[PDB]
Amino acid sequence: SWEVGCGAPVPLVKCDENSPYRTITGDCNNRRSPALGAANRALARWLPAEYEDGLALPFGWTQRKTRNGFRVPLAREVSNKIVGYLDEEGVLDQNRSLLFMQWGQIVDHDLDFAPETELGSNEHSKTQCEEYCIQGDNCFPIMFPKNDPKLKTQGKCMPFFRAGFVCPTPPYQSLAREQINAVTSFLDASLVYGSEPSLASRLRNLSSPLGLMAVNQEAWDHGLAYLPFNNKKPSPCEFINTTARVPCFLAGDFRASEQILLATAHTLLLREHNRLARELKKLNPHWNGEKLYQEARKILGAFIQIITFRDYLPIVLGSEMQKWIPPYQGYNNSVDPRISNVFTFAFRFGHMEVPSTVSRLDENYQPWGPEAELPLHTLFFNTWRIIKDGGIDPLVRGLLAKKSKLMNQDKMVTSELRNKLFQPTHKIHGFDLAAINLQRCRDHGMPGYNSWRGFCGLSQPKTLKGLQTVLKNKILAKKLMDLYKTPDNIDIWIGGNAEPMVERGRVGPLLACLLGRQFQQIRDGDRFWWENPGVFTEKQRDSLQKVSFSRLICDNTHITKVPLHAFQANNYPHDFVDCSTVDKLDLSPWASREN
Ligand code: HEM
Ligand SMILES: *[C@@H]1O[C@H](CO)[C@@H](O)[C@H](O)[C@H]1NC(C)=O
Ligand SMILES: *[C@@H]1O[C@H](CO)[C@@H](O)[C@H](O)[C@H]1NC(C)=O
Ligand SMILES: *[C@@H]1O[C@H](CO)[C@@H](O)[C@H](O)[C@H]1NC(C)=O
Ligand SMILES: [Ca+2]
Ligand SMILES: [Ca+2]
């Protein structure tokens, strides 16, 4: 079975045997083994890595090496022949807001992140890959099939650097290769406060004593705060509009500015943190800075947990929610709190829930301005459309009153992500999220679809007709088979996302299981979980399960009309109510009468 505890690139520094708030890094949540959950650890393996050479070469690296006796089809071919469509008409979800899609990506970003191998940006590494489409070491380029329009227009490939792997990063050569999770595995707002201690206090207002996060001093949203601007030049948010020179946002998470609505969701959360930390100096004026940061950090944490488990997961998982996430029976410190390698592919069902356009809505939820609807792809690394063109209230109104994309076996991923993705260093709106997600299953040595069906106790099809029956779809099945030649070779991402959806959910049985088990684990293995008796006082708890995303909007924007149930498809006048009609976070039980 072998390797016992390779624990290299980490400063070990041990634990603080009480510290009534979590570490920034996730360390010390588990007392038996303190690294469990922590960031800059290997993603857990639910099943063994599958590589060409059984060590680190991804399937389809060496042309004349099969997988179960067949070549693997090019990622981009799969993307083109299965994942593509033209007609955005009739593709939206009549019963899920755009908030449904946005929260997905919020929670996802809190849980897992496998950054690329740097290994030098003062090298051809970037050139030898993008420019010459040469496969080598960490350069794993997405080759185009023949008849591909990008042949005519871009080149022979689109760049792809393999994901960060533990012990070194300098090539390792003995046991199966394991990618890193650079955020804390715990639902702990790590995407707001950082997963490394350095960044964590950079994000903080140390200047004053009040316990705030650093807010923007260049620019404001009426009275209301923006995220601080991100140092690093080069900036991609600058690059897409050279004229506006509005750089990316600096959040706890580095993907914060990937698209306007996620930077938007980030901007609700900072505001809430500060809002919490004023109310506390209001009620507990003796409490110092640290105590106001951490005690606010603690509430926002529980807020993310409730919304997710109470509002989000029940409408992702549906019928299968109770089967996997039965009621809370308290902290089981034998539960693995870690994100699994497979879960970081399971959670990308989200990619099929992203619609082709984002609107900005006025106070009567009508086109704010003449350019109110925009193509998704203009909004990658787009920060200027926020500070120079209406703030967040009009984007939040969109989120509330526009709909998420329904996954459709025939219309999987909008060409806004499948042809027009911008990547932070490549200067063209010209990449393919879908082909990337497929190259990446291989990079991360993922087991085939059947292995994972196997894992969730579900049939393993070997035949076209066998596959028609599970996907409940003839032509989807024919194509998969024509490309993969066996269901054993189908990449977990696309495999999983081809299954019809479970009753009252937005994922299939295979995904429901993988996702179910993980949210089960991330709740049960968390020592700092909000419902874990002792973490919060019972009155604090009685206040907390009255919180609403509606409520989060009301206190952190100049928006006054909000739905009760912000994830269901909600129409203006009717399904919207006044903010006063909405339960608020009563922090009276936080009052410290130490005097
Ligand atoms: C642009 C992108 C999005 C929207 C415009 C978007 C949206 C989501 C949602 C809604 C998710 C979950 C419900 C979700 C999950 C994960 N994503 Fe994804 N996403 C966009 C773009 C990307 C890009 C680019 C990546 C990196 C792709 C790569 O493999 O190189 C990406 C990743 C993920 C991801 C894995 C994160 C990780 O562990 O590294 C999800 C769980 N998304 N996105
Ligand atoms: C710290 O808070 C003080 C008081 O509000 C304020 O003047 C200062 O801007 C804050 N610093 C930052 C960068 O948020
Ligand atoms: C860039 O921003 C400027 C204002 O800062 C705006 O007027 C212009 O239209 C923007 N250009 C693009 C391509 O978005
Ligand atoms: C705790 O989890 C471990 C490992 O998953 C399991 O063996 C055990 O039965 C669980 N105990 C309880 C009380 O849930
Ligand atoms: Ca795994
Ligand atoms: Ca986290």
UniProtKB/TrEMBL annotation:
Glycans are attached at residues 95, 205, 241, 332. Heme b 2 binds at residues 109, 255, 348, 351, 440. Heme b 1 binds at residues 105, 108, 114, 258, 348, 351, 440. The modification Phosphoserine is found at residue 198. GO terms for biological process: antibacterial humoral response; detection of chemical stimulus involved in sensory perception of bitter taste; hydrogen peroxide catabolic process; response to oxidative stress. It is found in: Cytoplasm; Secreted. It catalyses: iodide + H2O2 = hypoiodite + H2O; 2 a phenolic donor + H2O2 = 2 a phenolic radical donor + 2 H2O; thiocyanate + H2O2 + H(+) = hypothiocyanous acid + H2O. Heme b binds at residue 351. Its main location: cytoplasm. Its cofactor is heme b; Ca(2+). Disulfide bonds join 6-167, 15-28, 129-139, 133-157, 237-248, 456-513, 554-579. The keyword Disulfide bond applies. One of its GO terms (molecular function) is lactoperoxidase activity. Ca(2+) binds at residues 110, 184, 186, 188, 190. Its EC number is 1.11.1.7. This is Lactoperoxidase. The chain holds residues 118 to 712 of 712 of the full protein.
